[model samples]
Target chain A: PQITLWQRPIVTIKIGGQLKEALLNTGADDTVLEEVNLPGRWKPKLIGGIGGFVKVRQYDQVPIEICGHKVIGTVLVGPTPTNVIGRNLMTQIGCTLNF
Target chain B: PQITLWQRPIVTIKIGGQLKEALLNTGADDTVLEEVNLPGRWKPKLIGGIGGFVKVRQYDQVPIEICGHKTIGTVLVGPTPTNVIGRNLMTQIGCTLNF
Candidate 1:
């Protein structure tokens, strides 16, 4: 069994090329910014994944501030959620959710 | 080191004493009903953590239906974005993800 570490980190991100509040899940393995609660004028992009290259449609790189830390990231657009900060943001921030 | 397992299960849930669609994450360790998207007349609970009694604030036991199966569960409200389907529900359903 893998050592499972659970931590819920609620971070704020800018949506529609603007900063908005969103919850960050460290348990999630992907980077996605859902299409709900969005402003407008944000398009998706074809990006790469762990298995090589996957056509992931997301927004262009925008500025996001998490845990009072700011970083440039892209918003992944999908049919489900309005916004989600996934592993890409986690690795970028170097944040470890301590239990 | 324990093996790391990741699986995503999307299921519908009843919210605000009514049914609502939500994603079921196997990686989550607890059950919750977020107060943001709730209907009405829901209160928080005082519950516990792994250490001891944490006095988690939760509502009464309400029935939840997932994956075409119905089960009774309580909603633990918090200031977050997820209405997580945690280990408690996972044990009841005996549902495991393959990936």
Candidate 2:
């Protein structure tokens, strides 16, 4: 018998005064910042125009190394910390849960 | 005497390769993540709707306090080190500049 934990992986992040973990969804094409701590002008955008709903928003591009892949142009913002590793990442490196 | 530097303030962040600062804009409706190093599923999306482009996406709702107001529905995501404070926050507290 095999036990499958298909709940995806959860990662921890700190936004403002709140720190929490979120799921690593590969099915999503774009990363999403759904934390409530987000300000008004910097609300997370939903990406679309393709088949499924895409996460849309603007941020200073940076680089991120995930699962050993040193991905360039990692999306970034001001201060708050918390983001989902979306398609922009899933295409580069494969990921799994830490727990 | 009155003078205004409307270039918006830039904040420093680390994506993968190098770290840099970005402009702090309050007029931006949705926080934009234009960083290129993003992966496939985590790519940034463009927001459009309501005559203007409305940013849309999902994130874990968290609580944050700004300008004496503790925002309850602060949206958040996972493991990414960078983020932006969007409309969800601009509407709460009025900001100027740190420098």
Candidate 3:
């Protein structure tokens, strides 16, 4: 799959038996999602961005389907206007930036 | 050029007669850089992220060279840990996301 930068690179992702829209964010270090229910326990973590750092619950080994690629990686639960698929998960899906 | 996500997608850029390194950040909506001197009139603007929003100076039609590709676009100058080449400028360079 190839996504041009003419528009926001939003993609459909399947996580925890539900569908969600997520941006393929190469700038972010960790995958952050809007608050979604997960059954397992998670560790508290903080991720920094353009403004500052925010606290999030880190869930490891979460299975996610990005477009069509299936990957199990770490997902962070937090408050964000946009759900993001960061490099940690992008790497699992063999995502790259090309020109 | 194709950049794999294995490492931080940092590339050399030529801006304002100085050379600097920046990250190709798809997650960021606007191109944000550390304090760089630009000769032009700029408007004050605010950009948001995980933590909150920060004030910056927006300079339009700024010429920047990313990895040998020359482009002119809006660039925001402010405080950021890493200089970012966001989607706005990435579009000019014909950058895309691929798997």
Q: Fraction of native contacts in model 2?
A: 0.00
- Model 3: lDDT of residue B69: 96
lDDT of 3 by residue, A41-69 (tens): 99988876434668888999999999989
Candidates 2 and 3, the one with greater lDDT: 3
Question: For residues B1-99, could you state the per-residue lDDT of candidate 1 as single tens digits?
Answer: 111223333456655556654545444556775552443455645543423444444654556666555665655666334457764554455443211
Give Cα distance to truth, residue A21, candidate 2, Å.
2.6
Q: Mind sharing the TM-score for model 3?
A: 0.89
Best-fitting candidate, measured by DockQ?
3
Point out the higher-scoring one by TM-score: 1 or 3: 3
lDDT at position B58, candidate 1: 62
Q: Write the per-residue lDDT of candidate 2 for residues A31-75, one digit (tens) a residue.
A: 454543333344445454344544544342334444434554334
Better of 1 and 3 by lDDT: 3
Candidate 2 chain A has its poorest 10 consecutive residues by lDDT at A1-10
DockQ (C-alpha) of model 3? 0.75
Instruction: Go through the candidates in order and give each one's C-alpha lDDT.
Output: 0.50, 0.36, 0.88
Off by over 4 Å in 2: A1-4, A13-20, A35-56, A65-70, A73-83, A96-99, B1-99
